[PDB]
Amino acid sequence: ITGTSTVGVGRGVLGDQKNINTTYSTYYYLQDNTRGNGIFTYDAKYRTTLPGSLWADADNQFFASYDAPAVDAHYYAGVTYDYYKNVHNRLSYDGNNAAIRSSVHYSQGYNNAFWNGSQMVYGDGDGQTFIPLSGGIDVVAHELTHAVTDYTAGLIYQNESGAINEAISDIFGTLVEFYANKNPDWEIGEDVYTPGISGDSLRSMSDPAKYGDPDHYSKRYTGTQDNGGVHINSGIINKAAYLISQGGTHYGVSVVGIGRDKLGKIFYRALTQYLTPTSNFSQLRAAAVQSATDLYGSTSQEVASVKQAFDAVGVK
Ligand SMILES: CCNC(=O)[C@H](CC(C)C)NP(=O)(O)CNC(=O)OCc1ccccc1
Ligand SMILES: [Ca+2]
Ligand SMILES: [Ca+2]
Ligand SMILES: [Ca+2]
Ligand SMILES: [Ca+2]
Ligand SMILES: [Zn+2]
């Protein structure tokens, strides 16, 4: 909408206070004009018609329980935008400052979030498996990263390409979480997963097997559930990415860690310059090796570490 840029204040899903960029025209709307061609957050009002209504508020204060998922979707989309712009020189998900749209309060008791091809969508959870999912910065960045993938590599959402698609979202979700630097870890969704259980998460990148996800190619799922295991086999690539950054010895194979920033550079370059819609794990290895070669040189530690990490997870 046309209006003047304003700054509201509110509380997120976890009860933390934050400022948010809004737009005033009669109402204060969740429309952040400070980033690209805007970040827009919508109310789906417990239904499934999208996007719903652009979030309108009378006083620019967002402290109601109903406001919390909107506050976080809006704010964390901003953080994710900043990560891609500041770290990778990428302007929004399409590289041309496309407007970023999110809807919250999608459906009832909805234990998921997704990119629908045009926008991000967040359930409120059922209060047992999840609380409102936009409360997780890694979750928000995971969803926006699907848009980035779709505009770049275009990894088909099934089987190996789909598992790479998923891992890319977990990897950049985590790198965004570290970028914001509030309780960062290599776990996925811990802030909004199972409020009755402390210390767990939806997935782990550092040890995918803690939740039964594979950490080696020999343990890959080959069935048909979950689009051929896209949220399962992602563990193999998540583990490789974790090893590249942090190092470790895994099934007897030692990896020299090179840090998060270099992991991000290598995977961003792979995603945007080398991967294609049908890339498999072996092709991802080749893309990461080539990307590290471009950035750091063929004889570099970075290239050696990429090879070690894929060796460790059984991907040749
Ligand atoms: C429970 C499994 N879900 C996830 O892993 C994350 C949310 C996590 C990070 C909390 N959500 P996601 O991977 O974006 C869900 N994917 C998904 O719904 O894709 C199917 C689809 C495909 C095309 C259009 C719309 C939906
Ligand atoms: Ca208000
Ligand atoms: Ca965390
Ligand atoms: Ca996390
Ligand atoms: Ca939990
Ligand atoms: Zn995903």
Curated annotation (Swiss-Prot):
<feature type="binding site">
    <location>
        <position position="190"/>
    </location>
    <ligand>
        <name>Ca(2+) 3</name>
    </ligand>
</feature>
<dbReference type="GO" id="GO:0004222">
    <property type="term" value="F:metalloendopeptidase activity"/>
</dbReference>
<feature type="binding site">
    <location>
        <position position="190"/>
    </location>
    <ligand>
        <name>Ca(2+) 2</name>
    </ligand>
</feature>
<keyword id="KW-0482">Metalloprotease</keyword>
<feature type="active site">
    <location>
        <position position="143"/>
    </location>
</feature>
<feature type="binding site">
    <location>
        <position position="177"/>
    </location>
    <ligand>
        <name>Ca(2+) 3</name>
    </ligand>
</feature>
<feature type="binding site">
    <location>
        <position position="59"/>
    </location>
    <ligand>
        <name>Ca(2+) 1</name>
    </ligand>
</feature>
<feature type="binding site">
    <location>
        <position position="61"/>
    </location>
    <ligand>
        <name>Ca(2+) 1</name>
    </ligand>
</feature>
<comment type="similarity">
    <text>Belongs to the peptidase M4 family.</text>
</comment>
<keyword id="KW-0378">Hydrolase</keyword>
<keyword id="KW-0865">Zymogen</keyword>
<feature type="binding site">
    <location>
        <position position="185"/>
    </location>
    <ligand>
        <name>Ca(2+) 2</name>
    </ligand>
</feature>
<keyword id="KW-0479">Metal-binding</keyword>
<feature type="binding site">
    <location>
        <position position="146"/>
    </location>
    <ligand>
        <name>Zn(2+)</name>
    </ligand>
</feature>
<feature type="active site" description="Proton donor">
    <location>
        <position position="231"/>
    </location>
</feature>
<keyword id="KW-0732">Signal</keyword>
<dbReference type="GO" id="GO:0005576">
    <property type="term" value="C:extracellular region"/>
</dbReference>
<feature type="binding site">
    <location>
        <position position="200"/>
    </location>
    <ligand>
        <name>Ca(2+) 4</name>
    </ligand>
</feature>
<keyword id="KW-0645">Protease</keyword>
<feature type="binding site">
    <location>
        <position position="193"/>
    </location>
    <ligand>
        <name>Ca(2+) 4</name>
    </ligand>
</feature>
<feature type="binding site">
    <location>
        <position position="177"/>
    </location>
    <ligand>
        <name>Ca(2+) 2</name>
    </ligand>
</feature>
<feature type="binding site">
    <location>
        <position position="138"/>
    </location>
    <ligand>
        <name>Ca(2+) 2</name>
    </ligand>
</feature>
<keyword id="KW-0862">Zinc</keyword>
<keyword id="KW-0106">Calcium</keyword>
<feature type="binding site">
    <location>
        <position position="57"/>
    </location>
    <ligand>
        <name>Ca(2+) 1</name>
    </ligand>
</feature>
<feature type="binding site">
    <location>
        <position position="187"/>
    </location>
    <ligand>
        <name>Ca(2+) 2</name>
    </ligand>
</feature>
<feature type="binding site">
    <location>
        <position position="166"/>
    </location>
    <ligand>
        <name>Zn(2+)</name>
    </ligand>
</feature>
<feature type="binding site">
    <location>
        <position position="197"/>
    </location>
    <ligand>
        <name>Ca(2+) 4</name>
    </ligand>
</feature>
<feature type="binding site">
    <location>
        <position position="185"/>
    </location>
    <ligand>
        <name>Ca(2+) 3</name>
    </ligand>
</feature>
<feature type="binding site">
    <location>
        <position position="194"/>
    </location>
    <ligand>
        <name>Ca(2+) 4</name>
    </ligand>
</feature>
<feature type="binding site">
    <location>
        <position position="142"/>
    </location>
    <ligand>
        <name>Zn(2+)</name>
    </ligand>
</feature>
<protein>
    <recommendedName>
        <fullName>Thermolysin</fullName>
        <ecNumber>3.4.24.27</ecNumber>
    </recommendedName>
</protein>
<dbReference type="GO" id="GO:0006508">
    <property type="term" value="P:proteolysis"/>
</dbReference>
<dbReference type="GO" id="GO:0046872">
    <property type="term" value="F:metal ion binding"/>
</dbReference>
<comment type="function">
    <text>Extracellular zinc metalloprotease.</text>
</comment>
<feature type="binding site">
    <location>
        <position position="183"/>
    </location>
    <ligand>
        <name>Ca(2+) 3</name>
    </ligand>
</feature>
<keyword id="KW-0964">Secreted</keyword>
